Design a protein around this ligand. Structure first.
Ligand SMILES: Nc1ncnc2c1ncn2[C@@H]1O[C@H](COP(=O)(O)OP(=O)(O)O)[C@@H](O)[C@H]1O
Ligand SMILES: Nc1ncnc2c1ncn2[C@@H]1O[C@H](COP(=O)(O)OP(=O)(O)O)[C@@H](O)[C@H]1O
Ligand SMILES: Nc1ncnc2c1ncn2[C@@H]1O[C@H](COP(=O)(O)OP(=O)(O)O)[C@@H](O)[C@H]1O
Ligand SMILES: [Mg+2]
Ligand SMILES: [Mg+2]
Ligand SMILES: [Mg+2]
Lengths: 354, 69, 355, 163, 354
């Protein structure tokens, strides 16, 4: 009979509704056999403690991308589902601590005083909830405020080669807002949001130490996302940093996000998609390469008077190779932003900084 | 969606008695093309070992997977 | 009712495979509804059929939140959009819903976005010139009335400023109604275009409007960007065939329609073409450009804008659209840096009315 | 021995390879009733279907299902060797495809098939197909045939093409 | 009784080990394989294919392995000797001595796979390091305790630049050195050990202060990729447990990324740009972040990069420029004119040029 054969063998419990068994894992990817009630882009928790994000849902397995190291995950491990999507912390208590890609504090200041829970993949603002860019974003540089002046709500790109003035332009604009943030006028203050993605460990520690000595790290969010972590952590650095800065624009304050850099975010998204058994596109990249950078930059727009009156400035730096701006990732970001700041390497070596 | 090795020809030999000849050193050529030869067998054959066909052509077993070489 | 209910079996990106019953499976280019957690819905267009009572569908929105085994009901027809005089002055989406916070579109009929083009016997040739107001357009390549116009140019040359300046001096004094359908634009360009038309008399919230607004920039996924050209052209085709009016379709940009289909072509089971494009580049571009022509019922002056990839006219998305346009206004990046406003090429621009 | 029935070539070669060795000493009639008992005790049972889609198994849960569905079921010939070849090659998820291809070989070489109109035909096991179709169509049209589409669609398409 | 496995497949450096028991090995685990040469073999686990089988990568030649050999698991990673006992000896990728001077009598044996420093344990500085060249003390000045990159093509001057700087800075630095050569030549390894013994760097009968690590291009792909992790483990123990300014000299640094691309096609990963691996930014960021300056000690990294056929826009040359403080690009056009060396002033940049 069928009931007599299952009593002497079969299996045990382990329901595949809210849990699952990892059949294969490696190079960040983890094929979990099960998870029927798990939604798309949901936070998964393994038995070893490493977090996961199920991005590829098949009919027999479920491809989940690990957010950490895959050295503790083996075949047959239990992968539980949290029930929610990929969210991050937000609120006014995040100013003053170097957070990571999931909202955890990496500066050693204990827990983060979060006032809400916002998702990483959020929708951008519509045409009815947006107004014209009329405010003025004082960057501090004399050559940028008179020529290509940026405002609260616009997206200004920063294309250029290495060691030319890409990261120096975004750091000078955040320190120049100390004259308006130290007072009491909330309409003139602009909170900074540095999202260091793809940088090294020594580059993130040197930039945070210079802002704290000049009274500028008290109202600036630091998103630590080095290249020594997984591919899912560096690719989700742009969506997690935009959710924390969107809380101030929806209440009545101004924000300023700095996605440094835009070239490092494109290489991290193509690494996780190639390991999940997917077809590539151009230059060994995914098919939705232009849709990933255009969706994260469209949310940083100036709101109208009925939405609170806030705005969000986006400063995406584009790392070029020898001044070539006619590339695949260079031409895609220049046709989505409202202007760009070209940083040539010829005038930077002669002394004309920037 | 399927797999190689045992397929049609190689799947009808294990149901009866696949003995007689020594399959550890010899083997049956299942496919040949593009300068390769998928021999079915060679269990005790080491990696990068010299081989010989029935017509006198030499061979070198590069990859040694399960069921094929 | 006999609703075709399906079950979600696969979900990777914008493509979502729905498994239905045997015989009750939907056809191609069919809208599939899906109940979410909010008050809206998840529209999904069926692209192809993988077999075994399953068809691969392309979602027109965010695919986050879908689990394996959810209910997927079929509408029975394609993506219906609101047509008529009720769509003028309102901001419509790719699925035919309002995004202007002005209530629902009170339309008596709803036509589908997927339709066949005109035949060879229904084509009506013409040779009338259309005055735009520029000195370099009225002397070099003149625009033809009722034909397709293409404003080719690179990034930062003057593609968005050319379509906005011509609509404030030709579309505001024309007898017919306009149809500004933006596909693959920006978030700030959609809010600035709607506010400029209200202060000039093109879109009246309390009176009468003669300009159809169709939203759909690059802030959505790949399914809403590729279907934005078919939804905007369905409202302009009804005013020239059923009503008989000289409609003016303004597409910005025209290069975003070909790039949106190649983003989901790799996950649908198709091999890539040249420069990372899809194999059906000439078939998808010809089916949408032939329907926006001039027939015996009315004319349709399409003033689309093509975006060259990093200033390159030899690409597969720029050279394939040059054979389906009468007047081509190609722009150069070298003339824009010298002070020419705008950078109009006097030798690269050609037209059929220059005889 | 290979019969002319094609039946695909990769997925349909599972039942065709075992049919050559099972067609000796009259061992084809017992394989039809034994193949139906393996699919009915793994589908509508909700007991032994805990390893149908999982990638576990591995000897323990792979050899225990082939011995319980042959010793206590209804198998004694070479019916137990069919489940062992699909357990090591990871092919136990498509058990309905291997059992459906075995019944098509006995109905083709010892009977008719195809169809005709309305429902099924008769599928006689005489010899030729022309002498059996004329003797079965006259006896089936009179008895029954409720006749409750194809002719109405062809007449409407011819009138629209000439207008 | 340790965890024993069986070999199921072998295609080059990739060897699939099928474990009979349920306790499978984890990632980056050293596996033993007895054969018959008083050396056995060293296999490192990379990923798990499922069904009680994991794909391992051998660190030596896989010629002679049959299907079904015994694969014993060590239970940990590839450990190597650390401390003061490794100074003056020629170690390999598995920590064994290759100088024919007996075994390395070390107290502790740390693993080659370890995590890098966090954001709170980093320490940035701006101390200039005088090298002695006229084109390096004025153009791109090197930093003490940072990462120095000597980029250039074949025949320009990559191996001669690292030898001249080690004979005028490392001889009077005070701390210990770490010359770990990966992908070098056969004659370069023997000539470097004989020149350092006659100058006082490595003393066989006295006190030494320079750790030598073998690993040329004559080995397989598993030993070349693991040569960078073995040399960096000895230099990290002298700066954290002892607190000394170590000097890591890699020659060359481009051999670590080129060795992993040849074995990535047999592990199931898809190819990237120019036929490279998909995890190019993840593998290079995990090893470059651990060779930085921390709060316990500094680590002056003086590696050298190799240009692929004289091209700086490659995937192995452009990805290593974002993890170095000072870069020294060597152009092939200036080497044919008579410049000794071909120090490009329009391409070499540094962070200390202020
Ligand atoms: N106004 C300035 N005056 C002098 N030096 C500057 C100025 N702005 C930038 N720099 C130099 O440019 C370098 C930029 O380094 P880095 O930020 O690593 O590269 P990138 O700017 O390309 O991101 C800094 O080391 C800094 O010394
Ligand atoms: N008639 C004109 N005179 C001066 N500047 C112009 C004129 N037309 C366009 N421009 C400039 O061209 C730029 C076009 O920007 P944008 O629309 O973002 O790129 P594209 O035109 O390629 O879409 C604008 O910033 C504007 O300053
Ligand atoms: N300062 C110098 N003066 C003259 N020749 C030099 C100098 N530095 C390097 N060279 C030459 O450059 C060559 C480098 O050879 P090699 O090390 O094999 O290639 P690579 O430098 O690309 O590794 C040497 O043959 C040497 O003659
Ligand atoms: Mg920077
Ligand atoms: Mg534009
Ligand atoms: Mg050298």
């Amino acid at each position: 009979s069928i009931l007599e054969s299952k009593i002497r063998g079969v299996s045990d419990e382990a329901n595949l509704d809210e849990t699952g068994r990892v059949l294969s894992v490696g190079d960040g990817i983890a094929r979990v056999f099960g998870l029927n009630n798990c939604q798309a882009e949901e936070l998964v928790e393994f038995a070893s403690g490493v977090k996961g994000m199920a991005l590829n849902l098949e009919p027999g397995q479920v491809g989940i991308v690990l957010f950490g190291s895959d050295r503790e995950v083996k075949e047959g491990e239990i992968v539980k589902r949290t029930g929610k999507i990929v969210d991050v912390p937000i609120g006014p208590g995040m100013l003053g601590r170097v957070v990571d890609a999931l909202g955890n504090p990496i500066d050693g200041k204990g827990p983060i005083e979060a006032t809400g829970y916002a998702i990483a993949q959020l929708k951008a603002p519509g045409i009815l909830p947006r107004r014209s860019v009329f405010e003025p974003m004082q960057t501090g540089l004399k050559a940028v405020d008179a020529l290509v002046p940026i405002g609260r709500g616009q997206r200004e790109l920063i294309i250029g080669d290495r060691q030319t003035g890409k990261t120096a332009v975004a750091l000078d604009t955040i320190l120049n807002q100390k004259r308006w943030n130290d007072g009491n006028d909330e309409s003139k203050k602009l909170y900074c949001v540095y999202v260091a993605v793809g940088q090294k460990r020594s580059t993130v520690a040197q930039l945070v130490q210079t802002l704290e000595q000049n009274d500028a790290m008290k109202y600036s969010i630091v998103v630590a996302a080095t290249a020594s972590e997984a591919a899912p952590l560096q690719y989700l650095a742009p969506f997690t940093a935009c959710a924390i800065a969107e809380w101030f624009r929806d209440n009545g304050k101004h924000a300023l996000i700095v996605y440094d850099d835009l070239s490092k975010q494109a290489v991290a998204y193509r690494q996780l998609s190639l390991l999940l058994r997917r077809p590539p596109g151009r230059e060994a990249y995914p098919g939705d390469v232009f849709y990933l950078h255009s969706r994260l930059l469209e949310r940083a727009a100036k709101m109208s008077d009925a939405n609170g009156g806030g705005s969000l400035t986006a400063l995406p730096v584009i790392e070029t190779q020898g001044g070539d701006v006619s590339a695949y990732i260079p031409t895609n970001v220049i046709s989505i932003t409202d202007g760009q700041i070209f940083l040539e390497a010829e005038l930077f070596y002669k002394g004309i900084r920037p | 969606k399927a797999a190689p090795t045992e397929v049609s020809s190689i799947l009808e030999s294990k149901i009866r008695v696949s003995d007689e000849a020594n399959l550890d050193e010899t083997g049956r050529v299942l496919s040949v093309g593009d300068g390769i030869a998928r021999v079915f067998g060679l269990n005790n054959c080491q990696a990068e070992e010299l081989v010989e066909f029935a017509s006198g052509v030499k061979g070198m077993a590069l990859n040694l997977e399960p069921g094929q070489v | 009712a006999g609703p075709a209910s399906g079950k979600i079996r696969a979900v990777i990106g914008a493509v979502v495979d729905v498994q239905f019953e045997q015989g009750e499976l939907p056809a191609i280019l069919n809208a599939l509804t899906i109940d979410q957690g909010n008050n809206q819905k998840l529209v999904l267009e069926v692209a192809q059929h993988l077999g075994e009572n399953a068809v691969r569908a392309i979602a027109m929105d965010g695919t986050e939140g879908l689990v394996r085994g959810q209910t997927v009901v079929d509408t029975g027809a394609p993506i219906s959009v609101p047509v008529g005089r009720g769509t003028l002055g309102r901001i419509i989406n790719v699925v035919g819903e309002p995004i202007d916070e002005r209530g629902p579109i009170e339309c008596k009929q709803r036509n589908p976005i997927h339709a066949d083009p005109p035949s060879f016997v229904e084509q009506s040739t013409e040779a009338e010139v259309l005055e735009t107001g520029i000195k370099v357009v009225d002397l070099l390549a003149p625009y033809a009335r009722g034909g397709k116009i293409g404003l080719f140019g690179g990034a930062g040359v003057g593609k968005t400023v050319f379509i906005q300046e011509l609509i404030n001096n030709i579309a505001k004094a024309h007898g017919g109604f306009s149809v500004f359908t933006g596909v693959g634009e920006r978030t700030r360009e959609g809010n600035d275009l709607y506010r400029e038309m209200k202060e000039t008399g093109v879109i009246n919230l309390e009176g009468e409007s003669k300009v159809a607004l169709v939203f759909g920039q690059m802030n959505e996924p790949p399914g809403a960007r590729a279907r934005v050209a078919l939804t905007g052209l369905t409202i302009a085709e009804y005013f020239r065939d059923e009503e008989g009016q000289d409609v003016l379709l303004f597409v910005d940009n025209i290069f975003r329609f070909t790039q949106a289909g190649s983003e989901v072509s790799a996950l649908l089971g198709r091999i890539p073409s040249a420069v990372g494009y899809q194999p059906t580049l000439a078939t998808d571009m010809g089916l949408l450009q032939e329907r926006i022509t001039t027939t015996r019922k009315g004319s349709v002056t399409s003033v689309q804008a093509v975006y060259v990839p990093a200033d390159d006219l030899t690409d597969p998305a720029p050279a394939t659209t040059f054979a389906h346009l009468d007047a081509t206004t190609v722009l150069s990046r070298g003339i824009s840096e010298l002070g020419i406003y705008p950078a109009v090429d006097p030798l690269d621009s050609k037209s059929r009315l220059l005889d | 021995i290979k019969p002319p029935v094609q039946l695909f070539g990769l997925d349909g070669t599972y039942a065709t390879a075992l049919f050559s060795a099972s067609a000796k000493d009259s061992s084809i009639e017992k394989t039809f009733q034994s193949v139906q008992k393996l699919s009915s005790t793994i589908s509508k049972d909700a007991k032994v279907a805990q390893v149908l889609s999982n990638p576990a198994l591995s000897l323990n849960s792979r050899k225990e299902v082939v011995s319980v569905l042959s010793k206590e079921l209804k198998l004694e010939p070479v019916v137990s060797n069919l489940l062992t070849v699909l357990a090591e090659n990871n092919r136990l998820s498509l058990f309905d495809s291997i059992a459906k291809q075995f019944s098509v070989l006995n109905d083709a070489y010892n009977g008719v098939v195809e169809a005709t109109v309305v429902s099924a035909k008769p599928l006689d096991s005489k010899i030729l197909n022309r002498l059996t179709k004329s003797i079965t169509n006259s006896k089936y049209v009179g008895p029954g045939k409720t006749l409750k589409a194809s002719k109405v669609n062809k007449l409407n398409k011819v009138l629209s093409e000439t207008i």
